[PDB]
Amino acid sequence: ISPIETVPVKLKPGMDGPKVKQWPLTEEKIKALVEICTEMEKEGKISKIGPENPYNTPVFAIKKKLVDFRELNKRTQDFWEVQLGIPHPAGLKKKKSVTVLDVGDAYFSVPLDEDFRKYTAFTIPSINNETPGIRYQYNVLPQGWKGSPAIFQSSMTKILEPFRKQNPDIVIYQYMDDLCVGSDLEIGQHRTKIEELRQHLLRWGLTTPDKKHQKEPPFLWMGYELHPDKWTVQPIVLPEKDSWTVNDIQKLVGKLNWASQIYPGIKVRQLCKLLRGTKALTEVIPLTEEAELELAENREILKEPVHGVYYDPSKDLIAEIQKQGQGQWTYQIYQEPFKNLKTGKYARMRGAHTNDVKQLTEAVQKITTESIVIWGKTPKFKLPIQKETWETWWTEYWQATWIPEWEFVNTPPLVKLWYQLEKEPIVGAETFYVDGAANRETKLGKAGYVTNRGRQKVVTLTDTTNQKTELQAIYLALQDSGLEVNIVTDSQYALGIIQAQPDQSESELVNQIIEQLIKKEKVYLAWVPAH
Amino acid sequence: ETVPVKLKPGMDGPKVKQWPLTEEKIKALVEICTEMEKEGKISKIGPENPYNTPVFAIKKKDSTKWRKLVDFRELNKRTQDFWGIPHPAGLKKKKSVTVLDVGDAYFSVPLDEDFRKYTAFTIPSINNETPGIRYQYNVLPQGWKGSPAIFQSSMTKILEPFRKQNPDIVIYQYMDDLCVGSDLEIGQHRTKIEELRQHLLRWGELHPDKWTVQPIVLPEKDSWTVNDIQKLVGKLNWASQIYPGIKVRQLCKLLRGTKALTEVIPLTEEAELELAENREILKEPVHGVYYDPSKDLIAEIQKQGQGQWTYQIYQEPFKNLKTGKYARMRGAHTNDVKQLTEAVQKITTESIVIWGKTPKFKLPIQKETWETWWTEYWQATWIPEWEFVNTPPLVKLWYQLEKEP
Numbered sequence: 001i002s003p004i005e006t007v008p009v010k011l012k013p014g015m016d017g018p019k020v021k022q023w024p025l026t027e028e029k030i031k032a033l034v035e036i037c038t039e040m041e042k043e044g045k046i047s048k049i050g051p052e053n054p055y056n057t058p059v060f061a062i063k064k065k066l067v068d069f070r071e072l073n074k075r076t077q078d079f080w081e082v083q084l085g086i087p088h089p090a091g092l093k094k095k096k097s098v099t100v101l102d103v104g105d106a107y108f109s110v111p112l113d114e115d116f117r118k119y120t121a122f123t124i125p126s127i128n129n130e131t132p133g134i135r136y137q138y139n140v141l142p143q144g145w146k147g148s149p150a151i152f153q154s155s156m157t158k159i160l161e162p163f164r165k166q167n168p169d170i171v172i173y174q175y176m177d178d179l180c181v182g183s184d185l186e187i188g189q190h191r192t193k194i195e196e197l198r199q200h201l202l203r204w205g206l207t208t209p210d211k212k213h214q215k216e217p218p219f220l221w222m223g224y225e226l227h228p229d230k231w232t233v234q235p236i237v238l239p240e241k242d243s244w245t246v247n248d249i250q251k252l253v254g255k256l257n258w259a260s261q262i263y264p265g266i267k268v269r270q271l272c273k274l275l276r277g278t279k280a281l282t283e284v285i286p287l288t289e290e291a292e293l294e295l296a297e298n299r300e301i302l303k304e305p306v307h308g309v310y311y312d313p314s315k316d317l318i319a320e321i322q323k324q325g326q327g328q329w330t331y332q333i334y335q336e337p338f339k340n341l342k343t344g345k346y347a348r349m350r351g352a353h354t355n356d357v358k359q360l361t362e363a364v365q366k367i368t369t370e371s372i373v374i375w376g377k378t379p380k381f382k383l384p385i386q387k388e389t390w391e392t393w394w395t396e397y398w399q400a401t402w403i404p405e406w407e408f409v410n411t412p413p414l415v416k417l418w419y420q421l422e423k424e425p426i427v428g429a430e431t432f433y434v435d436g437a438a439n440r441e442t443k444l445g446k447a448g449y450v451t452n453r454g455r456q457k458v459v460t461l462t463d464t465t466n467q468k469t470e471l472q473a474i475y476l477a478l479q480d481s482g483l484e485v486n487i488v489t490d491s492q493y494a495l496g497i498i499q500a501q502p503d504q505s506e507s508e509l510v511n512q513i514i515e516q517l518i519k520k521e522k523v524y525l526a527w528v529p530a531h
Numbered sequence: 532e533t534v535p536v537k538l539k540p541g542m543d544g545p546k547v548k549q550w551p552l553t554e555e556k557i558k559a560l561v562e563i564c565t566e567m568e569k570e571g572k573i574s575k576i577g578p579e580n581p582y583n584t585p586v587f588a589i590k591k592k593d594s595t596k597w598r599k600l601v602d603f604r605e606l607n608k609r610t611q612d613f614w615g616i617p618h619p620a621g622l623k624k625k626k627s628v629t630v631l632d633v634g635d636a637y638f639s640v641p642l643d644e645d646f647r648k649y650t651a652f653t654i655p656s657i658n659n660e661t662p663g664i665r666y667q668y669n670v671l672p673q674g675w676k677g678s679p680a681i682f683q684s685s686m687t688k689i690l691e692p693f694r695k696q697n698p699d700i701v702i703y704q705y706m707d708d709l710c711v712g713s714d715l716e717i718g719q720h721r722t723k724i725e726e727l728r729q730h731l732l733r734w735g736e737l738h739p740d741k742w743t744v745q746p747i748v749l750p751e752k753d754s755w756t757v758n759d760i761q762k763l764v765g766k767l768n769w770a771s772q773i774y775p776g777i778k779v780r781q782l783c784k785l786l787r788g789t790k791a792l793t794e795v796i797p798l799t800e801e802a803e804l805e806l807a808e809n810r811e812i813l814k815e816p817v818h819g820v821y822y823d824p825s826k827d828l829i830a831e832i833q834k835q836g837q838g839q840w841t842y843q844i845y846q847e848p849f850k851n852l853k854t855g856k857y858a859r860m861r862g863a864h865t866n867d868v869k870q871l872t873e874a875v876q877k878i879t880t881e882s883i884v885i886w887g888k889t890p891k892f893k894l895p896i897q898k899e900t901w902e903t904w905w906t907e908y909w910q911a912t913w914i915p916e917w918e919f920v921n922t923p924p925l926v927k928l929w930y931q932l933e934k935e936p
């Protein structure tokens with residue numbers, strides 16, 4: 001078991017050890033457990049106790065072709081976050097050999113802070129609740145108890161420090177019950193070192209596994225298959241059927257949504273459409289022709305092998321971004337052409353009002369943030385925007401914005417500015433003085449204008465809001481005016497526009513105005529206080 | 532010996548997440564930490580400790596050597612009080628201030644062995660390939676409010692000699708920093724500082740009198756267009772929130788009719804007296820604005836564009852304690868975030884220099900943009916508070932007006 005310094009565990013604030021009643025079992029489940037516990041009892045994992053323990057946890061007996069600590073846990077203090085973020089292939093380095101040792105029941109190999117052991121008391125029942133039951137407790141980290149994964153890692157970490165000091169050129173990854181160990185040594189020296197480590201472990205009681213259970217390359221990590229020279233994307237399989245329920249259609253869209261990252265072209269517009277007005281998860285929705293098709297158009301793509309290469313510190317890091325459509329972006333991070341480490345895309349973030357350059361700025365930062373985690377470095381960007389468009393925009397925008405070292409790449413569609421409000425009133429251009437008003441309660445409004453050239457109009461609106469009339473007024477202005485227009489309004493929202501000049505909004509109306517603005521040759525927006 | 536520090540009643544330790552760091556940054560931190568560990572300043576910790584404060588690295592204007600900086604903002608806020616030194620209202624008057632980093636003097640003092648757990652911090656591993664390296668403090672941390680406190684006597688104790696050697700010089704202490712101001716000319720100044728260090732060392736350029744909180748100036752022209760006036764009216768109208776004596780009635784009359792935005796309108800004598808009367812009101816800071824010590828200090832910033840930024844420090848809306856304009860520094864030409872953080876460090880130092888406490892900032896940047904790269908250009912020992920906001924189109928048009936030489 002272990003000569004390992006225990007970790008001092010405590011219960012949450014002022015709470016106290018579990019006292020749940022021992023679930024009753026058959027003569028067959030009892031004699032089963034009676035068997036396994038006299039075993040552990042001897043291995044040095046559990047310890048027969050008596051009436052000197054008020055605490056008790058419910059032991060069950062399942063046959064695999066078990067103790068419920070739920071409560072003990074909900075009373076156990078909080079530990080540090082047992083590593084929650086895991087490596088990503090795109091950040092792994094190629095290795096000559098990579099062995100994975102299975103420190104399975106290494107749990108029952110680590111001592112449990114003596115004092116705390118009591119709280120882990122449980123009882124074996126008697127044939128139909130007869131005389132006293134068999135009572136025990138844990139001397140080691142309990143499979144399923146809150147503090148065991150953290151305490152295990154801590155341990156494994158302390159134990160490896162010596163070995164790791166002893167051979168830097170040997171990377172050892174700690175994860176769950178596995179010790180994924182790799183190196184750049186010759187298969188022989190590697191094989192030799194694995195046995196050395198294996199034995200070091202053994203020197204502390206961790207009886208590392210046989211050949212039968214033995215694990216080897218490739219390895220399934222997240223959605224990939226890992227090979228020491230490179231990785232491949234675990235081929236995804238779309239089921240075929242004559243009956244699609246809702247769940248069936250969702251779990252699918254999910255899988256597909258995941259693929260969208262790696263695999264380019266995947267679509268689920270027509271597939272998502274089948275969820276409209278769904279009454280129950282089990283409902284059976286016949287697939288439209290369009291859905292039957294796209295589903296078929298994907299199956300193909302997914303039948304494409306996508307292999308990848310590992311991270312090479314001696315080489316540069318590059319990121320190219322493509323605007324797949326409005327608000328959607330595709331990116332691929334490679335060090336050497338067509339040999340990508342990672343790729344992925346960003347769903348049409350549907351804001352309230354922004355523009356392409358800003359949206360580009362966010363994709364760029366979501367990436368940078370990603371990159372820094374995976375590589376502790378940030379990629380050089382190749383962006384479909386002219387350096388002029390950039391300077392022109394950013395330099396003036398009202399908000400701190402920025403883009404790390406980047407370089408333009410003429411890979412259309414290139415992102416640009418759809419329009420630019422004139423910086424100064426247009427001489428010559430007609431001047432529309434607009435006004436919209438509505439009764440917010442009766443939702444009845446009117447919108448219209450009058451120009452310095454004597455042109456006027458007014459439309460009566462119903463089921464509208466005031467902002468809508470204010471904006472409609474402006475829409476009409478752009479509609480009835482020529483290629484160059486001046487527009488003065490007391491609209492607070494129109495003021496948000498002159499300052500942000502959005503090219504996409506949550507408001508269809510705003511969108512229409514945008515389509516109008518994009519159409520003029522010159523537009524000057526002037527805001528003025530009301531009344 | 533150690534003094535018993537504690538947490539404000541019913542408060543628990545910080546459990547703030549360590550944001551990802553650059554390799555360069557991690558290498559240095561690891562390098563830096565194995566040392567302090569050696570020197571016994573810090574000690575690796577166990578999983579039974581769940582608190583955590585973020586950390587990062589910076590090049591304190593003069594380096595190659597990275598400096599370790601921790602964000603105890605949470606801890607500080609959760610740490611009991613000790614009810615520093617009363618603010619020398621006279622410091623802001625000195626002809627020149629020079630700042631000194633004296634957090635180095637804290638490792639000397641041992642931290643209450645029962646408060647250490649709360650000082651736990653983590654050094655991340657790239658690609659989560661390794662579990663973070665968990666440490667905690669055994670001595671006094673730099674950046675923690677309890678440090679300059681506990682080390683007060685010791686500190687006050689060592690400066691008297693110098694204080695008694697120059698009394699025309701003020702020594703102010705904030706966090707890890709030391710603000711030193713005097714009126715001696717430059718040479719006789721910086722020679723009096725290096726002289727100060729020497730002393731400071733055998734153990735372990737600001738000019739406040741130039742800070743002319745400037746006025747608002749309205750545009751003057753030969754001829755004014757309909758648009759010219761409208762813009763002015765707007766600005767004034769807004770400005771009326773500060774100076775209620777401001778009036779745009781007579782001007783809002785010249786604005787009768789649907790004439791071309793570009794057409795020219797002749798100013799009636801009335802609209803002229805009126806304007807002239809407004810020019811007067813804007814001639815001096817509004818009456819009755821007084822700093823409240825039992826109220827938070829606010830610093831709102833605006834991106835005027837073209838490397839320019841403006842700021843206002845108040846406590847109550849429209850009741851500004853100071854106003855300023857910041858122009859980017861040579862080098863930050865294409866970096867909005869660098870310009871911004873340099874701006875913020877400046878304002879916070881001015882704030883400290885005048886009121887001896889940091890202001891809570893209101894920033895014109897997205898949380899994401901900010902959090903991603905601010906540490907890249909931070910150079911101060913302390914970290915002020917902030918929130919991200921959307922600049923009202925008017926507030927900018929108005930302050931963009933402030934005067935210049």
Ligand SMILES: CC(C)=CCOc1cc(NC(=S)c2ccoc2C)ccc1Cl
Binds near residue numbers: 095098172221
């Ligand atoms: C995280 C993980 C799945 C590790 C084992 O798989 C591999 C990891 C690497 N490269 C590295 S840097 C490595 C070796 C041991 O632990 C790590 C994190 C390469 C190929 C495979 Cl097959």
